[PDB]
Design brief:
The structure is a homodimer.
Chain A: E1 6-7, E2 12-19, E3 26-31, E4 42-43, E5 46-48, H1 55-67, E6 71-83, E7 89-99, E8 113-119, H2 121-129, H3 137-149
Parallel strand pairs in A: 2-7
Antiparallel strand pairs in A: 2-5, 3-4, 3-8, 6-7
The structure holds samarium (III) ion (6 copies).
Cofactor (chains A, B): Mg(2+)
Binding site for ATP (chains A, B): 1-5, 47-48, 84-86
Binding site for Mg(2+) 1 (chains A, B): 46, 92
Chain lengths: 156, 156
């Protein structure tokens, strides 16, 4: 690793979680619309990481802001890079998380969030095939989470 | 986050740890030489992440391979991007870690590793100022670790 390399500045960071319940259902957040006839796409509870702050703590805070649920990160799953049209790079971080016990889902309805909810493994497979999951990485990490927790893999 | 972006493929991933002992000393690994008169530079225990495997588990394994110490990741600190001369991108991941109790440091001497050892906060500051820390990010993360653990910040 003593090989010379240059720094590739990353301007933005986002942090989110793949939160599963006892049945292996995954918690997703839905965007508010897209034509006016279609429903918004789904994504994992996530949000922006403040410059200089810990991404893991941000994942916990942002998840609560969107779903109203207090979560505990259990293990890092992965990070991936995206580039906006203008060249800005964003590094997204994803953790496997567990919800604290005794909580009721209470999504924060905003101009960006329609709602949030738990979706079963079978229904997620349908949503994915129907092109309703905003970022395909969600399926990659959900699969990792199911394996980590000892749940059956996604249908077919 | 519903804004369109493209994928920026990252070909290589590395995972390492900032491991501190009860006194706040940091565990570092030294490269084998550099002119033949100078000592190798120092870096955190780290190694390559296999394609498709969990970076956090890799951090634990690679740390043990270089230092002979079994470590437990306690919290994710950050990830950053580098680019090799040929254009290849490498994403380095860093975790704060704790060493399992009752262990003796036993570095793996190879053509790439001269040795490994715990360095105090004061001596790290000297090594850094003397340009002996391969990646400056090591100081950034050591500072984070000291704060997280409640230790005094690096000298001056
Ligand atoms: Sm926020
Ligand atoms: Sm850029
Ligand atoms: Sm996978
Ligand atoms: Sm290895
Ligand atoms: Sm490339
Ligand atoms: Sm910092």
């Amino acid at each position: 690793e003593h090989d010379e390399r240059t720094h590739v500045p990353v301007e933005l960071r986002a942090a989110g979680v793949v939160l599963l319940n006892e049945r292996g259902d995954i918690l997703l957040v839905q965007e508010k619309g897209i034509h006016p006839e279609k429903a918004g796409l789904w994504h994992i509870p996530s949000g922006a990481v403040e410059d200089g702050e810990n991404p893991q703590d941000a994942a916990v805070r942002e998840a609560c802001e969107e779903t109203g649920l207090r979560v505990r990160p259990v293990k890092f799953l992965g990070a991936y890079l995206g580039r906006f049209p203008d060249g800005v790079l964003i590094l997204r971080h994803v953790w496997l998380a567990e919800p604290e016990p005794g909580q009721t889902l209470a999504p924060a309805f905003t101009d960006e969030i329609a709602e949030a909810s738990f979706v079963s493994r079978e229904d997620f497979a349908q949503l994915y095939a129907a092109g309703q999951i905003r970022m395909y990485q969600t399926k990659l990490f959900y699969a990792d989470a199911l394996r980590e927790k000892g749940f059956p893999a996604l249908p077919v």
